[PDB]
Write a protein that binds this ligand. Structure first.
Ligand SMILES: CC(C)c1nc(CN(C)C(=O)N[C@H](C(=O)N[C@@H](Cc2ccccc2)C[C@H](O)[C@H](Cc2ccccc2)NC(=O)OCc2cncs2)C(C)C)cs1
Ligand code: HEM
Length: 462
């Protein structure tokens, strides 16, 4: 109740906060739904409270440009001050201020145009295994749980291109990396440990001293230990040397990246490479199965650019007009990060009102992606909205990978291996909804964008 008068003090609209909880009780419907309702109810700018933390939501593209680009280094340098996390504070998505600039600069050469071109044969090989394993479920005639097999593909791709190691997750029913990584998705806003940090932020140093973390400790330890084995095997074996993500961090120690810092960056990449890639792929295939005209029209383009099921090329992947439209439209309906989050490093006036230091500024990506002002009938899947040329698309309304220095470091990587998977499977298969298919697709109410029930489809040849 201490800060619960800040937004009325500035003449900013917003829902009335509950004394101890603020507006967190309104997250029960889903953080995406709360931002949508607030966007329609209030204007271009509304204020909420996560416990004591004041949260300013902005939708003016001119204002969004200021916080994400112009004043990114000036003020909005840090994303969000998370609770008790332990050594994971050095992870790039959690780092702050100059430490983040150092980590980001060191990791930036990971995804250049040349490095994307070199890892293409690695990704293409996993795609062959993907088509081979998906054929077995098709010839049997059983429904396919998309998040399983496409999750194994994503886990294989990220580990193979970042650490040069083939863990064979596509052919491992009990793959340890997937079992570990999917534990990051279980935590939600109404979890007792996390909810206590929201309501009582002063508990974060307490749990830190007690060595309690918001992250699953079994998962953190397995990945840290498993990554440390791949690093030691990289130094003893000079023949297995590739200029990749893991190597780039090993070269940092010649100057300087800690073993914990190296483990922190690896955990982010493994989680991002597995979860986001497989989630969006499962939405794309859901939208294709529920829109057969779009799927067959997408297959028509593939068979033309790659005649006779020809293996794709790097350039042929980035040439495809309709494929880029299908992926961009999936990311419009299902932006996996509901919002873009920035924290005021100092006191700043944003849109005229003065915002105190420590407050959070939020760009409601999901709400702006579903705005009827920018998208006619926003709940419908129409790849025709987009073209491969994005000259007309506002960079601050359509933000599936964020914008500015803090944008997604792996956007080009994520778009490549998703398109490669789609090309490979669509030139060999067609996806149909079945009895277990949930239509319409209901979104989950906790954390990242996830289906309420796992997406299952039937897969046939051709
Ligand atoms: C930490 C994890 C176990 C928890 N998940 C939850 C579920 N919830 C409500 C959230 O995650 N809610 C919020 C959130 O999504 N924050 C995030 C917003 C975001 C989204 C996309 C890209 C970049 C940043 C920002 C956070 O720093 C998380 C922390 C993290 C790290 C490793 C593994 C899992 C999670 N970062 C990521 O998920 O980065 C991975 C990604 C990179 N590119 C796309 S996803 C925060 C309150 C954490 C509670 S605790
Ligand atoms: C469909 C796939 C993906 C989507 C939609 C996505 C989306 C996003 C978004 C919205 C952000 C925040 C942008 C901002 O705050 O301005 C982000 C940040 C980030 N992404 Fe992704 N992501 C994807 C895949 C990946 C992959 C595969 C990797 C790495 C292999 C990755 C690495 C990162 C990192 C490290 C950050 C934080 C960068 C920083 O804080 O400086 N992402 N991503």
């Amino acid at each position: 109740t201490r800060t619960h008068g800040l937004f009325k003090r500035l003449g900013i609209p917003g829902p009335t906060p509950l004394p101890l909880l603020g507006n967190v009780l309104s997250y029960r419907q889903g953080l995406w739904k709360f931002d949508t309702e607030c966007y329609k109810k209030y204007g271009k700018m509304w204020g909420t409270y996560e416990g004591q933390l004041p949260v300013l939501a902005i939708t003016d593209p001119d204002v969004i440009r200021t916080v994400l680009v112009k004043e990114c280094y000036s003020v909005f340098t840090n994303r969000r001050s998370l609770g008790p996390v332990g050594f994971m504070k050095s992870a790039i998505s959690l780092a702050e201020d100059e430490e983040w600039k150092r980590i980001r600069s060191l990791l930036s050469p990971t995804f250049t145009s040349g490095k994307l071109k070199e890892m293409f044969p690695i990704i293409a090989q996993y795609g062959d295994v993907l088509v081979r394993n998906l054929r077995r479920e098709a010839e049997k005639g059983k429904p396919v749980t998309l998040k399983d097999i496409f999750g194994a593909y994503s886990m294989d791709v990220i580990t193979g291109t970042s650490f040069g190691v083939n863990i064979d997750s596509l052919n491992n029913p009990q793959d340890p990396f997937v079992e570990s990584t999917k534990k990051f998705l279980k935590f939600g806003f109404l979890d007792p440990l996390f909810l206590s940090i929201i309501l009582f932020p002063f508990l974060t140093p307490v749990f830190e001293a007690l060595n309690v973390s918001l992250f699953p400790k079994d998962t953190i330890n397995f990945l840290s230990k498993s990554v440390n084995r791949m690093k030691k095997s990289r130094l003893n074996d000079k023949q297995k040397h590739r200029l990749d993500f893991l190597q780039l961090m090993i070269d940092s120690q010649n100057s300087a990246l800690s073993d914990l810092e190296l483990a922190a960056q690896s955990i982010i990449f493994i989680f991002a490479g597995y979860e986001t890639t497989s989630s969006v792929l499962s939405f794309t295939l859901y939208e294709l199965a529920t829109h057969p005209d779009v799927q067959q029209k997408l297959q028509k383009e593939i068979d033309a650019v790659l005649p006779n099921k020809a293996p794709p090329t790097y350039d042929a992947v980035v040439q495809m007009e309709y494929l880029d439209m299908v992926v961009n439209e999936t990311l419009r309906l299902f932006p996996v990060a509901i919002r873009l989050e920035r924290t005021c490093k100092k006191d700043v006036e944003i849109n005229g009102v003065f915002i105190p230091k420590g407050s959070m500024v939020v760009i409601p990506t999901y709400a702006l992606h579903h705005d009827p002002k920018y998208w006619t009938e926003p709940e419908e899947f129409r790849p025709e909205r987009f073209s491969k040329k994005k000259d007309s698309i506002d960079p601050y309304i359509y933000t599936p990978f964020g914008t500015g220095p803090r944008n997604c470091i792996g956007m080009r990587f994520a778009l490549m291996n998703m398109k490669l998977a789609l090309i490979r499977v669509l030139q060999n298969f067609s996806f149909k909804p079945c009895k277990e298919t949930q239509i319409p697709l209901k979104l989950d109410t906790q954390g990242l964008l996830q289906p309420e029930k796992p997406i299952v489809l039937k897969v046939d040849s051709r």
